[PDB]
Amino acid sequence: MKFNCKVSSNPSKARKALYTANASQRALMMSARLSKELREKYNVIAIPIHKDDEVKIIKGHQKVAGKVTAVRRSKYVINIDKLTKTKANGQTVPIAIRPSNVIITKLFLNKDREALLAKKAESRKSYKELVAKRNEEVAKAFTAVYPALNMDIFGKKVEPITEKKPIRIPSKKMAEKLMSKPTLRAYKTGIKVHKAKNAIAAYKAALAKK
């Protein structure tokens, strides 16, 4: 849940802010993910797309690769040289592609992407050390109460409790008299249905034993 009073969770106000966003904030929305080869080299997940950036389409009819020829921030789309359509009379026109349906394979890095790719790298490392610091304190507290156990038990399979101790309460006798007629007939139907399912399984088991 969101706890910040300054931001709004209204869909109508979210779309309006998107259509009236100025050119400065329209560039950050047009971001695409780096490929595996580029992610390992820079340790950056996604950067805003750029001209002359090579990409590969991953969603749509044609998963071709090409070079970004146009970034249209008003339409919130991009253009690839490979993806084109002939305009009936013979001339061809580019086809718009949403930047979120492509992944960047080759970068156009003049001088500022070096600044950006470096800055977005230290941020990733600084947050990992913050998560690591917090994860060791949770482990430090858990062992202080359960010294014999390890924090790794949470990431593994869980074995439920099999004990079925019943409790005698003098209200189970009235449970059917505290139900409304619509919900009592549904409760009793589910009981009768389950018995029939349980009676067939018993009959089937006898034949299997036979």
Binding site: M1, S9, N10, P11, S12, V138, A141, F142, V145, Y146, I153, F154, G155, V158, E159, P160, I161, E163, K164, K165, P166, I167, I169, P170, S171, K172, K173, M174, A175, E176, K177, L178, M179, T183, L184, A186, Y187
Partner: protein
Amino acid sequence: STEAGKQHSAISWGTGRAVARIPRISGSGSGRNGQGAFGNMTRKGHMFSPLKNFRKWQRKTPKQMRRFAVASCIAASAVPALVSARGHHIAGVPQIPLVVNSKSISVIKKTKQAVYLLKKINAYSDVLKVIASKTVRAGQGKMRGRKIKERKGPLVVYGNDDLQAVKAFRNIPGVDTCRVENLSVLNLAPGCHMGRFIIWTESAFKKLNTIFGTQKKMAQGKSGFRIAHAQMAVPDMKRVVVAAEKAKLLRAKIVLPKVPKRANPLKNWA
């Protein structure tokens, strides 16, 4: 708006013009002129008695009757027949008043650990049903922001010393937490159906006697409130029936005799 539909200088044209007597817009040059006016049957007029912001939104209930219903809502959470009938998967739970150790709760700090606890006590059948059956709203309510409609799952009731484990349980879909003192019908009987699946912690469970008291002791955390007695002591009719049968006070069961059909003795010899 208090001035909605009444923003015209319209007056009626009277009779003698072959048009109704409803007020009409004044002037000329537009299609609006000579049209209907304020009346609620007309277009662009005020409606029937316009809705006023000083209506009675919030309601009042006596405090003792508010507490009477909470105890009945807590008591109904310990009946598996009613808890299941409300729509809760509690087949695998060990005990229906599910209480967990306060030492185990004190180590919960992440949602991965909170999920682990729910799986161990077999409460994940309810948590998964809400996850698996989450859907979207059906109607105009989506324009207003209410899109997703989820089901109800387990309710986690904690005490004063379990205030750090709340942040872990809050992100789990269809798992609502509450404090033992802040209990109300809005949690215990959502949708006006009683028998919410409540998961107690050790501290909250051990405080229930102080807060509510008993049928012989007045509550400490609720001044003036004492748990009432039912109209009958043992709400079962069988023990009285077997007592009179033992005492030979009951007549035998009666099957209505088959009433013979009318016949004609003047012709039917039988």
